[PDB]
């Protein structure tokens, strides 16, 4: 209901960034707070009453503004600051209170090549009629990465899905998991299972493979 700006931003480690929050009505008794929400976690109160930091929040965070215009400043952007930030305002005492739309903060860092691991289907899963082969790309930057599956050096398509973690709080990297799904018969029909990774941090595509058995 309140307007935040920008919708998303990016900067490097150590940069100073600002997020703006604007409302139509003036804030009542400085009731303006800033929350930080990391992936899969509840929002966390960073600043309350416009400019007061909650205990434990690094002094790199600061809040300013008045009336209808407020600012959250991060003076030395760190990897652990990757989150969506929300302002929240109260305008009277009867129920006129709301959140801003949120501002995503991404952090740019140096290129980092992923560590590739591969996992064959477990025997427990092979007891059923399905087989899942997992390829893990660990701690890479930037997010862009190509994962291709090869079964007896035949390229697969439409039978794999991937999921990516959010930027890591310590090293700003992403991790990715790609799962290839086959039937038990198709899995037992072939020998070499490989996953090839294309990323900026690698001089050439990196393939991890295994032989069934």
């Amino acid at each position: 209901q309140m307007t935040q700006s920008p919708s998303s931003l990016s900067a490097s480690v150590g940069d100073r960034v600002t997020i703006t929050c604007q409302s139509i009505k003036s804030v009542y008794n400085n009731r303006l707070g800033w929350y930080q929400q990391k992936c899969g976690k509840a929002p966390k109160l960073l600043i309350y009453e416009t400019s007061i930091l909650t205990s434990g929040v690094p002094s790199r965070f600061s809040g300013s503004g008045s009336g209808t215009d407020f600012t959250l400043t991060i003076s030395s952007l760190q990897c652990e600051d990757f989150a969506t930030y929300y302002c929240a305002g109260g305008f009277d005492r009867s129920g006129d209170t709301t959140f801003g739309q949120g501002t995503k903060v991404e952090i740019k860092r140096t290129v980092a090549a992923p560590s590739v691991f591969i996992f064959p289907p477990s025997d427990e899963q092979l007891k059923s009629g399905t087989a899942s082969v997992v390829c893990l790309l660990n701690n890479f930057y930037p997010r862009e990465a190509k994962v291709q599956w090869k079964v007896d050096n035949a390229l697969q398509s439409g039978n794999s899905q991937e999921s990516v973690t959010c930027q890591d709080s310590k090293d700003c990297t992403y991790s990715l998991s790609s799962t290839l799904t086959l039937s038990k018969a198709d899995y037992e029909k072939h020998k070499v299972y490989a996953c090839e990774v294309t990323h900026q941090g690698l001089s050439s595509p990196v393939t991890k493979s295994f032989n069934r058995g």
Partner: protein, 213 residues
């Protein structure tokens, strides 16, 4: 956890959603409790609140379909949402205002970690847990073929192993069921014990799976 949230997880349309937020520890504070929800990929939406005087406030959209109450003998706050539809699918949070304000969002200093609610016609299904066995090194667990998405819980060594753990977002498979992976990187000295504890509450599925070389 200080604000323990409980809910059914997966609900069918037109049912009544009943959620609880239990204060797990004693606090000499005369606090208020506010209910907020977050649809997937969206922002925070105020549902309502209850003050230290038990004064109960409702947002405009919620006043005709939500009831908020408190059971002081259990320190347990209740939210009931009637005639749910798929539009009510969201993560539901409770949060504490330490000033005792029931209609304020600017100073929510303590949050529950949220309870997922998926409103759909599709049947609940418990997942299968398979080991991603190592060939540093990496191991993990594959939680496959479940519905609805969350509340799902994945811990390692019952909470002891946290460093280097990447639990990936769940992907919706072409079968209409969700799959998730949780990996951890460890030194190549693996002897020691690596068990993953997965808990799919909507299906009452509690599985402790040991991952071995």
């Amino acid at each position: 956890v200080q604000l323990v949230e409980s809910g059914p997880g997966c609900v069918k349309p037109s049912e009544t959603l009943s959620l609880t937020c239990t204060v797990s520890r004693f606090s000499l504070i005369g606090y208020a409790i506010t209910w907020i929800r977050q649809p997937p990929g969206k922002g925070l939406e105020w549902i309502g609140g209850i003050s230290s005087a038990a004064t109960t406030f409702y947002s405009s959209w919620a006043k005709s379909r939500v009831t908020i109450s408190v059971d002081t003998s259990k320190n347990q706050f209740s939210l009931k949402l009637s005639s749910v539809t798929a539009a009510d699918t969201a993560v539901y949070y409770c949060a504490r205002d330490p000033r005792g304000y029931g209609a304020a969002l600017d100073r929510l200093d303590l949050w529950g970690q949220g309870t997922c609610v998926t409103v759909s016609s599709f049947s609940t299904k418990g997942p299968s847990v398979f080991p991603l066995a190592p060939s540093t090194a990496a191991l993990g667990c594959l939680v496959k073929d479940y519905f609805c998405e969350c509340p799902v819980t994945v811990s390692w060594n019952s909470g002891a192993l946290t460093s280097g753990v990447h639990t990936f977002p769940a992907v919706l498979q072409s079968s209409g069921l969700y799959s998730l992976s949780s990996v951890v990187t460890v030194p190549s000295s693996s002897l020691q014990t690596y068990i993953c504890n997965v808990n799919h509450k909507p299906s009452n599925t509690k599985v402790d799976k040991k991952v071995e070389p």
